[PDB]
Amino acid sequence: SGFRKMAFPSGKVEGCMVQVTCGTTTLNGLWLDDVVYCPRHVICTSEDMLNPNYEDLLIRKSNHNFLVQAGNVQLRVIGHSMQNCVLKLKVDTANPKTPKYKFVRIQPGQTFSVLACYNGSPSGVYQCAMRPNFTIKGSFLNGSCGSVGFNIDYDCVSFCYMHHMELPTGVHAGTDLEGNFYGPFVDRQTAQAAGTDTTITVNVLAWLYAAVINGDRWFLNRFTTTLNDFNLVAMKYNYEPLTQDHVDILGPLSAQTGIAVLDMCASLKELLQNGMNGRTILGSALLEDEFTPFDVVRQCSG
Amino acid sequence: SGFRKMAFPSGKVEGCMVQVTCGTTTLNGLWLDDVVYCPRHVICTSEDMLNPNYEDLLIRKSNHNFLVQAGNVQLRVIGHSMQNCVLKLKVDTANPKTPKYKFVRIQPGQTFSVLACYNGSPSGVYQCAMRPNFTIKGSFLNGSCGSVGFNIDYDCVSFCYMHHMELPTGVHAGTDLEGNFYGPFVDRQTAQAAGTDTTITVNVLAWLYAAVINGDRWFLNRFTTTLNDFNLVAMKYNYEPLTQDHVDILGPLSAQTGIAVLDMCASLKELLQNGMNGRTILGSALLEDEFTPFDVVRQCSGVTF
Ligand SMILES: OCc1csc2ccc(Cl)cc12
Numbered sequence: 001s002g003f004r005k006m007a008f009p010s011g012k013v014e015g016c017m018v019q020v021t022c023g024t025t026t027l028n029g030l031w032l033d034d035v036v037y038c039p040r041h042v043i044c045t046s047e048d049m050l051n052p053n054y055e056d057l058l059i060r061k062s063n064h065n066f067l068v069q070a071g072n073v074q075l076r077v078i079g080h081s082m083q084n085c086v087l088k089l090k091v092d093t094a095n096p097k098t099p100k101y102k103f104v105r106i107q108p109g110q111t112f113s114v115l116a117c118y119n120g121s122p123s124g125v126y127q128c129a130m131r132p133n134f135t136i137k138g139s140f141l142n143g144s145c146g147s148v149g150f151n152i153d154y155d156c157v158s159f160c161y162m163h164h165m166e167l168p169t170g171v172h173a174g175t176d177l178e179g180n181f182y183g184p185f186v187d188r189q190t191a192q193a194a195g196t197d198t199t200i201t202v203n204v205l206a207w208l209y210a211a212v213i214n215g216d217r218w219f220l221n222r223f224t225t226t227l228n229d230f231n232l233v234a235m236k237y238n239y240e241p242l243t244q245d246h247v248d249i250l251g252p253l254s255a256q257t258g259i260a261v262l263d264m265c266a267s268l269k270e271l272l273q274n275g276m277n278g279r280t281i282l283g284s285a286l287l288e289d290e291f292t293p294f295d296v297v298r299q300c301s302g
Numbered sequence: 303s304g305f306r307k308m309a310f311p312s313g314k315v316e317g318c319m320v321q322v323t324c325g326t327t328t329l330n331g332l333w334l335d336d337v338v339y340c341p342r343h344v345i346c347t348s349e350d351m352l353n354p355n356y357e358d359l360l361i362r363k364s365n366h367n368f369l370v371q372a373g374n375v376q377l378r379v380i381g382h383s384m385q386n387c388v389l390k391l392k393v394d395t396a397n398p399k400t401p402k403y404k405f406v407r408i409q410p411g412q413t414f415s416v417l418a419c420y421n422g423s424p425s426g427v428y429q430c431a432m433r434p435n436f437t438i439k440g441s442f443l444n445g446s447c448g449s450v451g452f453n454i455d456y457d458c459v460s461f462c463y464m465h466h467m468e469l470p471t472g473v474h475a476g477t478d479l480e481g482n483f484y485g486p487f488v489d490r491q492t493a494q495a496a497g498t499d500t501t502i503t504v505n506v507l508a509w510l511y512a513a514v515i516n517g518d519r520w521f522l523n524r525f526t527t528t529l530n531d532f533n534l535v536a537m538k539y540n541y542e543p544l545t546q547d548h549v550d551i552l553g554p555l556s557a558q559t560g561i562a563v564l565d566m567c568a569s570l571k572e573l574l575q576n577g578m579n580g581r582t583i584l585g586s587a588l589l590e591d592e593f594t595p596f597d598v599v600r601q602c603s604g605v606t607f
């Protein structure tokens with residue numbers, strides 16, 4: 001029993017973290033095969049962050065401007081190229097600890113684990129979700145740029161996030177491993193702010209199913225709802241619209257508990273209207289939206 | 303910025319997880335040097351669990367009755383012995399990935415990371431606290447037994463917990479790595495229950511300090527109090543008593559925020575008496591007590607391993 005915000009075992013990503021230094025700036029890099037991936041703003045001064053011309057900054061760099069350090073060993077750079085907002089540094093050594101991996105760009109609502117790192121050294125691991133406004137609610141300090149987010153389905157590491165910045169509201173923005181930012185953000189010190197965030201409705205529903213699985217039923221009721229009537233109510237609580245896709249993905253959790261999706265939607269409607277009256281669901285006094293349907297099935301059945 | 307329930311990187315411990323099978327029961331083992339550690343109830347059957355004589359049950363098993371698989375490769379058991387409630391299986395091969403490590407016993411209120419495993423394969427990592435009633439609120443399914451809890455201090459893994467059982471309320475119980483149980487629990491099929499839990503007061507204060515560090519300040523006020531006065535309130539709300547030792551531990555946090563410990567207990571005083579008034583603290587409507595003061599420091603500092 002029990003239900004926890006659970007991250008993936010981080011060992012496969014730990015063996016990939018290196019330190020990248022350029023000038024006075026040092027951050028983290030991801031060392032896979034003979035390539036080290038890191039945020040391209042490593043080549044920027046503070047003067048440059050307002051309107052950096054990354055092509056012009058990079059052209060003035062040679063390979064030996066980049067110090068890559070893997071634990072105690074210095075890695076020697078033999079090439080460099082820019083792909084969108086990541087720098088790709090070719091090094092003379094393939095990482096002997098390179099796991100089975102792929103790059104995946106994820107959708108809002110998808111979860112993943114973050115390995116926070118400083119100076120190429122892993123500090124901790126925690127579970128995150130891509131918010132609907134394409135930010136993540138992480139825990140990052142200065143020097144954490146280049147830390148990555150990942151899933152491990154079987155023993156293949158699916159890299160989906162690399163940390164680039166913290167926005168004014170204390171949330172975090174970054175790119176996929178192709179260097180494409182999630183959301184409308186840029187690696188540029190502009191007046192950019194996270195859009196108004198919303199609750200991930202399909203995830204709350206999955207987390208309610210998880211409560212029924214672990215033996216809780218107090219929040220159910222005898223009512224049902226149409227999909228559109230539910231969405232009309234939910235968006236008045238800043239909840240994400242629920243789509244038929246979301247209804248389909250919840251199917252297996254509906255079968256395991258015997259509660260139709262729109263019946264659980266009716267229970268979510270009543271919870272939003274009533275609260276919990278001094279009660280808790282799976283140990284929380286708020287409705288949790290950072291567990292996906294997939295996450296619930298992995299932790300409750302295996 | 304930001305504050306999240308953070309676990310230690312689990313790589314050093316992932317390389318020690320093995321699968322141990324004895325008969326039809328299979329669980330997880332910890333492979334360090336040339337010894338594999340696992341709960342001794344692996345040798346028991348369903349009828350043995352109601353009243354096992356582990357001494358007599360072990361003297362009847364032999365080395366070949368233990369199938370230990372290090373993922374791919376089979377490990378050969380050359381010897382077996384008991385220390386308290388853990389079984390020590392000598393193997394023919396030393397683990398090449400053995401990290402620097404110690405066996406430590408933690409105190410209730412201290413936190414640690416749990417690497418949940420099934421059939422010797424790690425499946426997830428999460429952060430736990432030893433509750434004052436000596437249980438932990440983990441997430442475990444059948445086959446999780448033998449999973450381990452740990453902290454990392456520089457390069458050294460400090461093993462503190464090994465999973466043994468789940469209680470009727472869905473919380474979990476286990477031993478240190480020397481086989482001594484946390485809490486008044488035994489490894490037999492008997493009527494066992496978690497006692498009434500209490501809230502780890504020093505940890506709630508540490509988490510309020512974490513909230514001030516992250517810009518949550520609405521709960522601060524102009525008042526202060528005394529250790530004696532606040533502990534009267536803590537007892538009323540099923541909070542652990544706050545000691546002068548706790549105040550000394552919160553020193554480093556009381557300096558970084560410039561808010562005295564007794565000053566913050568006044569805030570917690572008012573939160574316990576009047577509630578939250580619809581507002582949240584670090585994204586929570588409850589008072590979180592599974593962050594130690596060190597946890598809050600290390601996360602707002604950047605300490606890495
Ligand atoms: O991390 C350095 C930095 C300073 S301002 C700004 C804006 C965007 C990004 Cl990605 C980075 C930075």
Ligand SMILES: OCc1csc2ccc(Cl)cc12
Pocket residue numbers: 343351466467488489490491492
């Ligand atoms: O799964 C083994 C088992 C059955 S009942 C009981 C009570 C305590 C402990 Cl530690 C184990 C067990």
Ligand code: NA
Pocket residue numbers: 522523524525526565566568569
């Ligand atoms: Na005060």
